[PDB]
């Protein structure tokens, strides 16, 4: 409905934990566990108001689970891995008028190698959507 919008903040981040050989089974090449999350800003952190679902596109190595739909919050994706790669985060909005957006998030894996969770990276974008 017409020409008014709101600017909204969307944050895509990633955290990672290193998995020591002492904690992987015989045939498990996963050196890391990571968690990509999608969130709003400090002012309002819950994007459930205006977000319908999130599509996570991943590297072909994750086939057949390279495409993941998180419908209801928290919009998080946890997986095991060995490699860094651009994660394509595709957001769909509850309002039919606002078209979907892709956010390319560069996954950053931990290199402290202490086996503890660390903060990898963060991608921040401003989104426009029909207010009314």
């Amino acid at each position: 409905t017409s020409r008014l919008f709101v600017k909204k903040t969307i944050v895509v981040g990633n955290v990672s934990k290193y998995i020591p050989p002492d904690k992987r089974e015989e045939n498990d090449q996963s050196t890391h566990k990571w968690m990509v999350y999608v969130r709003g800003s400090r002012r309002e952190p819950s994007i459930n108001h205006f977000v319908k679902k999130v599509w996570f596109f991943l590297h072909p190595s994750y086939k057949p689970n390279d495409l993941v739909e998180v419908r209801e919050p928290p919009f998080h994706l946890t997986r095991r891995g060995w490699g860094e790669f651009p994660v394509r985060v595709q957001v769909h909005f509850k309002d039919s008028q606002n078209k979907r957006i892709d956010i390319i998030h560069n996954l950053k894996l931990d290199r402290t190698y202490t086996g503890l969770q660390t903060l990898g990276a963060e991608t921040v974008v401003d989104v426009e959507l029909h207010r009314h």
Partner: peptide
Amino acid sequence: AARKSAPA
């Protein structure tokens, strides 16, 4: 082309 590399 889809590229993936390990940190270490």
